[PDB]
Nucleic acid binder design. Structure first.
Lengths: 93, 82, 323, 98, 110, 107, 93, 82, 97
DNA sequence: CAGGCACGTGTCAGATATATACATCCGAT
DNA sequence: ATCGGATGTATATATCTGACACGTGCCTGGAGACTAGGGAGTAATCCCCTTGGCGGTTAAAACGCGGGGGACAGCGCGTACGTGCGTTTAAGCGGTGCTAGAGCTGTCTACGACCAATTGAGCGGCCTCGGCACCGGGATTCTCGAT
DNA sequence: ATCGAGAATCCCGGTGCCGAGGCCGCTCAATTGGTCGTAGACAGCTCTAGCACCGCTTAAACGCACGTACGCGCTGTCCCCCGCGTTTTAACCGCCAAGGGGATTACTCCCTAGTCT
């Protein structure tokens, strides 16, 4: 079969931030588990919000509210700003 | 108008009654101020989530459902309201 | 006087059956069509037609729209729909139902030409239905039914004189035509508490004299096939006709004859009469009903007159069993 | 001059407030406090009465539990008078502040 | 036709895959329908969080005089930060360890 | 029987539970036996809560269940207290519990 | 707007176990909330199991394993026994 | 050979090292039995959930994935493995 | 003979066991304990090595946290020697009892 | 689609709860 | 022993709940064999990962023992917190009036599900050399007994 | 209240190692381009209830007096845990077999869907 992972993406992010650093296999696994955990939490919160509001779909607004409601303070604010910038860039085509 | 200070509205006898329900006999003097601070921070934590839930629904009224969802989000599930 | 009213309602439930796959309409629409067809007055308003309770607004609105405009836009739209019309046309083939026609139209098979060109996609039953599409849809005059009944009885007594065969249905009731043949057979050695080759002998004998031309399904109890009368070496060949053979135990044979003789309205009235007389009558036997509704041991049946006497009802000839 | 020993008039109040179910906090000051807290996140907000009642229920239960844990810590520290450091320790062990 | 392709992650200028996020959102059975802008937003949030935690981990690793990040550096970066520790308060890191913390009372008074 | 609940001999609705399982987007296909089993579990838990509340409600010469009685029934039991250890009940009050050290002198 | 409540079913259960007593409206709402919470918990655990084992459906086993996971020992055993009895009774008819 | 009395495998120096990493200065003598008891309780609680997990999938080997699932169920969320 | 004062040889190796990240519990006794606990539920069960390692990691982190809370309670109690009653208080406050 | 019907909601008689009066009975002083 | 808070006992409100009344979306609506295919239950293999065993080395555990510093009990005190009383003041109940916005419904309209067709990205396999683990000695630093 | 002996630890240097990272050969999931049913965005309507205000009414809050008892500092006893040295021991590493278990096909078998009059 094939086991999908965020290894290449985490590596690219690490190179984009610290050009002269490496990472071990166990640290990569921990980073992958952290990414999956955060993704699962945000997706679950968005699904719960959609169910509460009688809606049938999850949009950028639901994910934004979930991010604002999970992450604390300045981390949430910066995540919302970065995501809004990315969404604007994507919708600009 | 604009509410200047209301944390003093949680009077000393109210804290004393709550502590007696908790099961204490003698209460120090700083317990009141410390309990006011803790209650304020807990209310801030709950109210932030409730207001976020209200804003996501594009509503101007914070209903009890938003409050119970905010309470359930922190693991402090509340019964009897929805 | 609702010839046009009845005809327009006919196909509506068919699309509900073969396309929408909802029998819970089909049955209601056919009940409504039957009750309109026997009403001896030309309908003027849907509210007047609502006097048949069960005309909930759904039929009343359709009949009012039909009277006002001469048609139904839903019906007109569903008539010109290629998929629905193709499915309805395919379901006219015996063995092709809602699922089969739907799947064939899904893969593009929509006409008899494609059905003929795709032999490998058909079972034996569907191929036989395809071969005799025209013949099966033809009606059968009573004189032909007399000839083939005589042939069937001759062959059945040729197999064994103790066999008893009765052709039931509208032909037994004296109707001038029928759509198919339901022939009921029994054997004295075959009872409810008693040979799996009794029907096989009759089928083989009828195939030997070249009366039965095809076999659709053949089991130990009922046989499905095709029959065709032989031509007198110079006339056009007779169209192929659907013939049914059912083997019934002796203690249930006359009850089966009563059930398959009809008509459906007559059978329903007889069942209601049995129920109000404290008896239950089914396809297979008759049973007494207790004070609490518990059915007892089935009563012995040796004649149709016995069944009529059980429910304290005068024996009625099959010609008088219209309702 | 009928004066009770200090401590008896504590248990006479303990049993009463443990046997009852009253909210023990005046409703209007709590409503004003809730509105004052809420106006810091979004101006011009209006509250359903049931929401304020649920907030009062939750805060009352949380404070009662915190006071129970404070009492346990105080008794563990060989003492019968609760002190703010007892509340600090209870919240710290519960995992709340840090 | 079929103009030359360019991944939606590259369209949004993100290192994380928005297509994989969209597929996971669809096949995780979270909602009946999934909007087009949600995967991009979620991938941007994930990329920002990963970039922050990796930046602190790299700073700690260079502080410890190493070129390669190990789980100890990740634990140090997570616990040293105030917001990240609050985010991952109920998370245990394998081979992470414990931040050096000795109570002031236990120190020798002398 | 006609209703699905009557076939299983339960008072809880099989149909409503099945409909909630479908709409709740828990899985895109739900087996036939799951709603009946879930209804049985919910019925048993409700019966346990109600019988414990009645055995508590009855004891104060009161013949009507009050939220205080529900809180007493949940807190008094051990398994139910573990099941609902992080749940607060409106108008539930507190168990009567005074520490032995807090009690006064023997005298 | 027709609300969805468990009122009549809770009342039927109470009459089945304590015919001589009644229940107040607030206690009725508390029971409704408790039933909703337990149902949500069990359904969520079963969905998690179904997604976990790569299955694409929820059967009686998923709910049973969820019941065994959440409820404590005696409660779990009695709930599994009652539910298995109900499933066998429903299947046999 | 069915196992017996393996809670004594958690030696006193091991508990001492764990406490030193915890940050204690000096350790009493009656604490080791309490530590062994709470360790046994926690291990039983985790392994019961893990075993229930590994039986719903018709399997006889306890995978680290099942341990991670059981730990996440109790509110631990152990990273690293899987 | 040179003897260190009691307490110094504690804070020393407190620095060591807080700076380092090994297991601090032997593998085989913990494996045998895990197997003995498991056999009470289902007989003849197999364990992956990674499963035992994850169990050890989670249990050891839990014990470290419990000892941290116990030390905090002991310091609050005007005392530097941790006692079983401190563990009982910490477990009761945390909600485990 | 047409019936059959279990819940949802509304209404009023009334068991059940609550508060109000006096006679005993038990921890501080 | 006396006397203010807990008990019972009887009575008079009072009130929120259960037995009817009526509507409204759910809810389930013939049967008896005769074809035709499906998830899977078991028969049969294929690695292969965990189980078990045996032997050799030795870091670690168990055991003894001399302290010395910390746990702990008892005393004294003085000030912080309890109970009580007169007074105020703000909560609470009951109207009275007003409109902001929650809730619902009709109408489309862009939006996401779904399906061919295409292809570039990420996973598996396979090197390979360098950051780091490990060892050894020197230099530096921390700790405790007296001068 | 530092000198100095003694021990613990950092630093520098040397050596080897195994896995982190890079490259190649792919398979298949991401991407494009279309269609088509519909979730909900946007206006319009009610009409419920949250808000503001006022007028009693009185029970809770509060300031102050006064007693008293409990936290805290202090002192003396003693006891038990820690640092160190000596003696087992089973933990761990090396090798082997081995054996049943997770992952495959594969025949068929009761179960389920279609059909039909």
């Amino acid at each position: 079969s094939r086991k999908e992972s965020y290894s290449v993406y985490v590596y690219k992010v690490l190179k984009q931030v610290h050009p002269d650093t490496g990472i071990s296999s166990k640290a990569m696994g921990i980073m992958n588990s952290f990414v999956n955990d955060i993704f699962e939490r945000i997706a679950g919160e968005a699904s719960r919000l959609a169910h509460y509001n009688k809606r049938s779909t999850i949009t950028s607004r639901e994910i934004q509210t979930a991010v604002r409601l999970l992450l604390p303070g300045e981390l949430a604010k910066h995540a919302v700003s970065e995501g809004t910038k990315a969404v604007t860039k994507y919708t600009s085509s | 108008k604009v509410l200047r200070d209301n944390i003093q509205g949680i009077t000393k006898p109210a804290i004393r009654r709550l502590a007696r329900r908790g099961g204490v006999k003698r209460i120090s003097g700083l317990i009141y101020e410390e309990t006011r601070g803790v209650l304020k921070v807990f209310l801030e934590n709950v109210i932030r989530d409730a207001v976020t839930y209200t804003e996501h629904a594009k509503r101007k009224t914070v209903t009890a459902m938003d409050v119970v969802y905010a309470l359930k989000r922190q693991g402090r599930t509340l019964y009897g309201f929805g | 006087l609702n010839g046009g009213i009845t005809d327009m309602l006919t196909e509506l439930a068919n699309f509900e059956k073969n396309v929408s796959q909802a029998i819970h309409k089909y049955n209601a629409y056919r009940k409504a069509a039957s009750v309109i067809a026997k009403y001896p007055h030309k309908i003027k308003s849907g509210a007047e037609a609502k006097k048949l309770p069960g005309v909930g607004t759904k039929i009343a609105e359709k009949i009012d729209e039909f009277l006002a405009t001469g048609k139904l836009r839903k019906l007109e739209k569903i008539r010109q729909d290629d998929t629905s019309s193709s499915i309805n046309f395919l379901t006219r083939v015996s063995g092709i139902g809602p699922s089969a026609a739907r799947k064939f139209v899904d893969e593009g098979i929509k006409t008899l030409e494609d059905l003929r060109k795709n032999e490998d996609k058909l079972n034996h039953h569907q191929r036989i239905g395809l071969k005799y599409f025209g013949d099966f849809e033809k009606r059968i005059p009573r004189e032909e039914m007399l000839q083939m009944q005589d042939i069937v009885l001759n062959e059945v007594k040729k197999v064994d004189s103790e066999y008893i065969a009765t052709v039931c249905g509208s032909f037994r009731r004296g109707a001038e035509s029928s759509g198919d043949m339901d022939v009921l057979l029994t054997h004295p050695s075959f009872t409810s508490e008693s040979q799996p080759k009794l029907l096989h002998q009759v089928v083989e004998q009828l195939q030997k004299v070249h009366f039965i031309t095809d076999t659709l399904s053949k089991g130990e109890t009922k046989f499905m096939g095709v029959c065709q009368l032989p031509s007198k070496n110079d006339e056009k060949e007779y169209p192929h006709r659907r013939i049914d053979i059912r083997l019934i135990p002796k203690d249930q044979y006359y009850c089966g004859v009563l059930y398959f003789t009809g008509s459906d309205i007559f059978n329903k009235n007889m069942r209601a009469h049995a129920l109000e007389k404290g008896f239950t009558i089914n396809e297979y036997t008759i049973r007494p009903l207790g004070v609490t509704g518990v059915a007892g041991e089935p009563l012995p049946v040796d004649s149709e007159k016995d069944i009529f006497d059980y429910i304290q009802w005068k024996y009625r000839e099959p010609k008088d069993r219209s309702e | 001059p009928h004066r009770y020993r200090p401590g008896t008039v504590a248990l006479r109040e303990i049993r009463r407030y443990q046997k009852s179910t009253e909210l023990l906090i005046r409703k209007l000051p709590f409503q004003r406090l809730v509105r004052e807290i809420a106006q810091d996140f979004k101006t011009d907000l209006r509250f359903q009465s049931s929401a304020v009642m649920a907030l009062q229920e939750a805060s009352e239960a949380y404070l009662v539990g915190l006071f129970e844990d404070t009492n346990l810590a105080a008794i563990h520290a060989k003492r019968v008078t609760i002190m703010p450091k007892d509340i600090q320790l209870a919240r710290r062990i519960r995992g709340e502040r840090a | 036709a079929r103009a030359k392709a360019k991944t939606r992650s590259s369209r949004a200028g993100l290192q994380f895959p928005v297509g994989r996020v969209h597929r996971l959102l669809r096949k995780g059975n979270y909602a009946e329908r999934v909007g087009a802008g949600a995967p991009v937003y979620l991938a941007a949030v994930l990329e920002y969080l990963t970039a922050e935690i990796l930046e602190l981990a790299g700073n700690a690793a260079r502080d410890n005089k190493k070129t390669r990040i190990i789980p100890r550096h990740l634990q140090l970066a997570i616990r040293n930060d105030e917001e990240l520790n609050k985010l991952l308060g109920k998370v245990t890191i394998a081979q992470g360890g414990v931040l050096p913390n000795i109570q002031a009372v236990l120190l020798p008074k002398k």
